[PDB]
Amino acid sequence: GAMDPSSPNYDKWEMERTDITMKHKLGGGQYGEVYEGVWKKYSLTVAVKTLKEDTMEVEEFLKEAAVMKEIKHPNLVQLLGVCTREPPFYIITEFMTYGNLLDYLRECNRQEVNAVVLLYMATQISSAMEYLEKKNFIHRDLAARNCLVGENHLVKVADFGLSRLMTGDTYTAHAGAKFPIKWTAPESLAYNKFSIKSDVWAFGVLLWEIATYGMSPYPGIDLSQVYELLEKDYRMERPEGCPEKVYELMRACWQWNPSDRPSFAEIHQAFETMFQES
């Protein structure tokens, strides 16, 4: 019985499929076939991600779970289990009540989610990233649409399908697939080179999304002209009401040369300080 500890095929992350109830579907977006559910064993609400026929290879789908088994942080969406073996595989995690950060910012009560709270959301995320950096992991998909919101303005980084444990300071992707131009660092766009610093650059973009309450980066700018603009030293302007110190932090994140970009440890301490000033 693989499900038994005595078994040689035992896996602590494998959970009894009949231990979960599939309620309302949450999909509608791009995360995939995401469902809301309940882990009866504890009547604990949970999020469930499913896999289909063609859609994606099983080795590709489980990649995200493999990554999530090695990271643990209050600001990183936590893995609760997986359902392999039979058809439709599942990936179960804690459930974030308010959905993705991007839509949250666009639908929120701006009087409640104010300057301090926005500041509190940036600090939490930089916290999760300081942990990933410290363990030499890269996320490669940092964006407001990939963060999740819980009660009390709790924010957690999600979507680890492209995350990787690095052996060095860099990771070179292959040449196939593409990457979100407006969130991707120059060296990643030009040479497909990723690193913690490329995550730092994306964090800067995420800050701008937060400061604008969900505006799309480089509004109105054609995607084919983004890179060359960035090469001519163009950078998004300071959002209305955005503190200059916070904006100066965005600019440091967008330094053309990776080594000129701050570390996530410096970024988090910088935000922790500003936030404590409350």
Ligand SMILES: Cc1nc(Nc2ncc(C(=O)Nc3c(C)cccc3Cl)s2)cc(N2CCN(CCO)CC2)n1
């Ligand atoms: C699509 C969606 N996700 C929600 N919560 C989530 N929590 C965790 C999720 C998840 O994807 N985990 C996960 C990860 C991160 C990686 C691998 C595998 C998995 Cl399974 S998704 C809530 C939600 N809504 C409730 C709030 N409504 C607005 C006001 O009530 C709108 C609808 N909608």
